[PDB]
Amino acid sequence: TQETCSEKFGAIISSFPVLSDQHPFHRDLMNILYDADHFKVALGQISTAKN
């Protein structure tokens, strides 16, 4: 059960773009479309649930 949960959570985390590694145009475009705080909080809650 925990292997299935960890595999799916890692697939969610490792596939979504990381804003700290994007070009400033792409990062700020994601910030315009999406609240970057909300994006990072959602992915951090995913990682917290995994751990």
Which residues would be at the binding site for another protein (CB under 8 A)? 35, 37-38, 41, 44-45
Map tokens 């909300």 to a residue: 38
| CB-nearer residue toward another protein: 5 or 41 | 41
Task: Quote the least distance from Cβ 33 to another protein, whole Å.
Answer: 12
Collapsed DSSP state (helix, strand, coil) of residue 29:
helix
Nearest to another protein of 10, 44 (CB atom): 44
Query: 43, 13 in Cβ contact below 8 A?
Result: yes
| φ, ψ for residue 22, nearest 5 deg | -85, 165
| Closest CB 44 distance from another protein, rounded Å | 7
